[PDB]
Motif scaffolding. Sequence first.
Motif, PDB file in Angstrom:
ATOM      1  N   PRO A   1     -33.755   9.044  45.118  1.00  0.00           N
ATOM      2  CA  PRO A   1     -33.375  10.383  44.669  1.00  0.00           C
ATOM      3  C   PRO A   1     -32.956  10.190  43.233  1.00  0.00           C
ATOM      4  O   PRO A   1     -31.811   9.860  43.014  1.00  0.00           O
ATOM      5  CB  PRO A   1     -32.159  10.688  45.528  1.00  0.00           C
TER       6      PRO A   1
ATOM      7  N   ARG B   1     -31.498  10.386  39.617  1.00  0.00           N
ATOM      8  CA  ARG B   1     -30.254  10.972  39.152  1.00  0.00           C
ATOM      9  C   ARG B   1     -30.232  11.313  37.692  1.00  0.00           C
ATOM     10  O   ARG B   1     -30.835  10.632  36.929  1.00  0.00           O
ATOM     11  CB  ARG B   1     -29.138   9.971  39.404  1.00  0.00           C
TER      12      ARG B   1
ATOM     13  N   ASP C   1     -29.793  24.207  44.186  1.00  0.00           N
ATOM     14  CA  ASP C   1     -29.402  23.190  45.145  1.00  0.00           C
ATOM     15  C   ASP C   1     -30.560  22.257  45.467  1.00  0.00           C
ATOM     16  O   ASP C   1     -31.727  22.558  45.209  1.00  0.00           O
ATOM     17  CB  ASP C   1     -28.879  23.833  46.431  1.00  0.00           C
ATOM     18  N   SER C   2     -30.217  21.121  46.072  1.00  0.00           N
ATOM     19  CA  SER C   2     -31.199  20.100  46.409  1.00  0.00           C
ATOM     20  C   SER C   2     -31.999  20.429  47.665  1.00  0.00           C
ATOM     21  O   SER C   2     -32.885  19.655  48.037  1.00  0.00           O
ATOM     22  CB  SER C   2     -30.500  18.751  46.565  1.00  0.00           C
ATOM     23  N   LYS C   3     -31.721  21.545  48.326  1.00  0.00           N
ATOM     24  CA  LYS C   3     -32.537  22.000  49.438  1.00  0.00           C
ATOM     25  C   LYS C   3     -33.501  23.104  49.044  1.00  0.00           C
ATOM     26  O   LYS C   3     -34.288  23.540  49.891  1.00  0.00           O
ATOM     27  CB  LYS C   3     -31.653  22.473  50.593  1.00  0.00           C
TER      28      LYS C   3
ATOM     29  N   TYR D   1     -33.377  22.181  38.989  1.00  0.00           N
ATOM     30  CA  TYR D   1     -34.436  21.756  39.901  1.00  0.00           C
ATOM     31  C   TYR D   1     -35.644  22.667  39.742  1.00  0.00           C
ATOM     32  O   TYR D   1     -35.501  23.876  39.589  1.00  0.00           O
ATOM     33  CB  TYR D   1     -33.974  21.817  41.357  1.00  0.00           C
TER      34      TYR D   1
ATOM     35  N   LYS E   1     -42.024  19.343  43.555  1.00  0.00           N
ATOM     36  CA  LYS E   1     -40.599  19.481  43.269  1.00  0.00           C
ATOM     37  C   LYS E   1     -40.108  18.307  42.430  1.00  0.00           C
ATOM     38  O   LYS E   1     -40.411  17.154  42.743  1.00  0.00           O
ATOM     39  CB  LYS E   1     -39.792  19.553  44.562  1.00  0.00           C
TER      40      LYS E   1
ATOM     41  N   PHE F   1     -38.738  14.491  43.104  1.00  0.00           N
ATOM     42  CA  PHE F   1     -37.420  14.476  43.727  1.00  0.00           C
ATOM     43  C   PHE F   1     -37.546  14.597  45.239  1.00  0.00           C
ATOM     44  O   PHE F   1     -38.262  15.468  45.740  1.00  0.00           O
ATOM     45  CB  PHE F   1     -36.541  15.607  43.182  1.00  0.00           C
TER      46      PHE F   1
ATOM     47  N   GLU G   1     -34.672  14.575  48.502  1.00  0.00           N
ATOM     48  CA  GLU G   1     -33.294  14.475  48.958  1.00  0.00           C
ATOM     49  C   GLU G   1     -33.198  13.423  50.059  1.00  0.00           C
ATOM     50  O   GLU G   1     -34.147  13.217  50.816  1.00  0.00           O
ATOM     51  CB  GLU G   1     -32.821  15.850  49.435  1.00  0.00           C
ATOM     52  N   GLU G   2     -32.050  12.738  50.135  1.00  0.00           N
ATOM     53  CA  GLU G   2     -31.952  11.531  50.958  1.00  0.00           C
ATOM     54  C   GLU G   2     -31.937  11.839  52.448  1.00  0.00           C
ATOM     55  O   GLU G   2     -32.290  10.980  53.263  1.00  0.00           O
ATOM     56  CB  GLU G   2     -30.703  10.733  50.585  1.00  0.00           C
ATOM     57  N   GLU G   3     -31.522  13.033  52.826  1.00  0.00           N
ATOM     58  CA  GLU G   3     -31.598  13.392  54.223  1.00  0.00           C
ATOM     59  C   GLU G   3     -33.022  13.633  54.656  1.00  0.00           C
ATOM     60  O   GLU G   3     -33.338  13.474  55.815  1.00  0.00           O
ATOM     61  CB  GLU G   3     -30.741  14.589  54.514  1.00  0.00           C
TER      62      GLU G   3
ATOM     63  N   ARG H   1     -35.640  12.015  53.308  1.00  0.00           N
ATOM     64  CA  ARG H   1     -36.387  10.763  53.230  1.00  0.00           C
ATOM     65  C   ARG H   1     -36.372  10.022  54.560  1.00  0.00           C
ATOM     66  O   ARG H   1     -37.400   9.495  54.998  1.00  0.00           O
ATOM     67  CB  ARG H   1     -35.828   9.874  52.118  1.00  0.00           C
TER      68      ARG H   1
END
Lengths: 72, 225, 225, 169, 72, 40, 40, 40, 73, 73
Positions: free
Chosen positions: B56, B58, C15-17, C112, C123, C154, C156-158, C160
């Motif tokens: 991710p 940064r 946001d990242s979502k 973003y 994204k 990009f 997001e870690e959830e 991945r």
Amino acid sequence: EADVASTENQHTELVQYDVTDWDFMMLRLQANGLLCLVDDGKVSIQKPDLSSEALETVTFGATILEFDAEMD
Amino acid sequence: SEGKLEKLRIVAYKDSKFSDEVENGEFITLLNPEKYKFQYRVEQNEDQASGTSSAPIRFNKILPQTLEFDFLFDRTGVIAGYEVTEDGIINDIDHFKKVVYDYNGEKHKPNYLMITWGSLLFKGYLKEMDIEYKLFRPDGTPIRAMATTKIGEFVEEELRTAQENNQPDMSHYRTVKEGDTLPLMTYRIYGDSKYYLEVAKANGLTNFRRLKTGTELIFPPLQKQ
Amino acid sequence: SEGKLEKLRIVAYKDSKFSDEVENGEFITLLNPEKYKFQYRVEQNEDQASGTSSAPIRFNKILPQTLEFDFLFDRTGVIAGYEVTEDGIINDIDHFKKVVYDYNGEKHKPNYLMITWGSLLFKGYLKEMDIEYKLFRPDGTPIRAMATTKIGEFVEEELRTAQENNQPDMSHYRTVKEGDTLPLMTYRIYGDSKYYLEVAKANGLTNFRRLKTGTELIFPPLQKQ
Amino acid sequence: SEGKLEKLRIVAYKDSKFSDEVENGEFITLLNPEKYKFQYRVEQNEDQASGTSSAPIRFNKILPQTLEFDFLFDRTGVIAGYEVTEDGIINDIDHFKKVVYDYNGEKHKPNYLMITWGSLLFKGYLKEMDIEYKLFRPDGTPIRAMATTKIGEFVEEELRTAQENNQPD
Amino acid sequence: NNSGTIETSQSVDRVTHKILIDGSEIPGTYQVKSIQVTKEVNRIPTARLVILDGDAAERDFKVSNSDHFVPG
Amino acid sequence: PIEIKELHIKITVDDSEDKQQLVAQCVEQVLDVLKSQKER
Amino acid sequence: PIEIKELHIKITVDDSEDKQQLVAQCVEQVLDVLKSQKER
Amino acid sequence: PIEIKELHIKITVDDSEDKQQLVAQCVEQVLDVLKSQKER
Amino acid sequence: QQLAKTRGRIKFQGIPTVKPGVNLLLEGVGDRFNGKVFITGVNHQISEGNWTVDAQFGLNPEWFSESESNIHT
Amino acid sequence: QQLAKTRGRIKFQGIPTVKPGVNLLLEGVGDRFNGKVFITGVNHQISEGNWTVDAQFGLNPEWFSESESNIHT
């Protein structure tokens, strides 16, 4: 501020001579199997605690960036 | 004054707020450049662990900007509107260098520059220059030269924090519209739904599970120590 | 609506979502790029000892992706469907930079980005930009410019870990077909044939050397530490 | 079957012995590459002392091999034998990437590859890829693309010692 | 010896070695990257071996898990 | 160095021995600085 | 190192982190040489 | 360093002073690590 | 001495809860080292876009009176 | 002290016979150093295609009781 584990023995006399308080404290504490933890102004003196729950899991194939270990 | 061909200007300044002009420190060109060019760079941190399929990336920082253009000096006598001078381009180049290059003993540095042409307005300093001399009179007086230039960008530190209006640290107010709930509004302001009982206590709400649709609420910041 | 020429769009997000839009944060181009390009990189570890004819290769990482394309801005008046504006391309470039480049004080970072055109959906983040100004009105108003862009990727870690559905650690079930044996099935699930007596004890099998062809078995995971 | 124009194939595998196929893991091209290229490197140790006229160069090791080629995807409608599809080349590229690039959660890695065309047979892994999109329908559906690829070479360690039949011992 | 060189029994084109543990050779699957041996007057002799190992895709170290390089 | 006590084992990286020669010079100059400080 | 006692704070230069990795390797090999000299 | 005790003599190589600046940074960071270990 | 049996360092993405005197679970580094480890030291490094932490496990068998200098006049 | 008069290191292509306690003949390094030298230490390094040896000559004048630490409690 302090939080110190108790001990069983009692001295009748003990002498501190020409040393600092920190150094004297370290000598006396090791002799009893204790570790000193200092954190945010508080001094905590305790025996090692290997029984508590792990905070998290760190894994080689997923989360580790670097690693070093030794057995001797 | 639409029909007027505007010419590019460069002015020198003494202070970092650009309000105190250097005396005799204004250059006006006689021929405009063909084009100009900008450059923008953003840097990220891209460390990742082995065994994984993506990182991710940064945000790190935004690097300074860059402007480039070219100039031509010519006093041969074929361009309408100008006269041939006894010494050619000698005084044109010497005045151009005094504005953009020379060290100023009053401020212990070279000058601050403002560059204006039409829609363009740029503040900064000179980094690089090359001047090449092309034609000469028989006694060695130059009459044509070409110059390439590179300018960096300057922002004063008091103005950087005013442009980055950096805002869980400040106070906020909203008005309740129909369809709002207290835990959903707390999530959009703080990033977590769990602060809803502290928002209700700071506003004197008892029946917070039904909000009335004209109420103005406050959202205090989180404490720091 | 097959006959409609679709135009490329870029939207900014908070946001990242990618569910909370920046207000007035959508850019639509007036001319499409000619082409676009992707880049993919996989890294391996290639250490070997001296005296050998080949190395033992081990997967290390998948590196982030990259997208590149070029844009053209023009308000001269020869392209059907558009009008000439009083200020040329000044407001087109200023709105494009506000979406993709400018620092946002609400989130302490740039925006973003989601990039959509036809089949394409990407994204990420801006890394690089160059803008070159080409034609001007006599008073210095620009009417043509060219832009080159580079975008990073990009995740997001959830998301991945949900895409890498990583599975000797989890539980498994199979149905017995005719031709199956217990040590061959244990080898394909664990990597070793030696666990066949633990699989038979966890299923209550006594005559494991002959399996009946409708039985559903469980395969428990191996223990840790 | 001499007269048949053979087409290049790529199959994905699960194990390092290349016997357990990935399900739905086979790609077949529609146009063959023009050419392909190999690379071979051998490394030596070349230290020498000062004052001398030559060194007896020593064997160090043999480096891994490399294969490179280019592909073209096109569904415009001028090539005999194929049909125009409603979505162009979208499903051709998505199936090609699933075979050679995508991470597999069963093995915690990308796939093992076997590349076969005529006399050629090569085992290894993907290192590099670039895809450039060229033509589009008016609604933004792509119909032509070009891909460049680089493949490394894989040998399992039990097979390396059997090929180096190392024999005073 | 005035030959101008160092006398060896064979050409110096190929260097070979063997590692024996408890009487026999370590299997030819292990790759030994480097070997160091030192000896000195009034000190105890030592040696070091560097072996390539570990795989992030498996989550383990096969040589370390073997009984070949165990203390003792 | 005039002593074999101060040599380190050589490990290279297959990243494709220039960096081996730079690290070996830095160990040499540190240990000369440490020896000179014990002079009178 | 197996100890956090021997790490140094990381300061980079905006000269435009390759040089950060080379200096960190030189501190690692010096402190291994100093530890081996106290062996019997 | 705040001490002239830790400077080394400068010797360059005519190989044709970039490498002089890298070695001097590595001596500086090693001696700061050795000084911090004697803190209480 | 038993607490000095296995020693090492683990580097990972930073969080605010790892402090000397806690336990972590270590996995994927071989049977010789896998298991629960006791943390004896922490190093937090924040720079250039990221926060990482170096966690130290195991004790040094040496005593204060043996390794520290200048205790006495 | 006399055995500490001249000290140094010689690096060359490896052979299995140089061990502490042997003599080598040193030539071509000037009248100040040329002659027979007594070997006090050996370092064998094998890697990346070659075997080399570092031979050490001469003694360190310091005594065990002067230079080694932690002899006493």
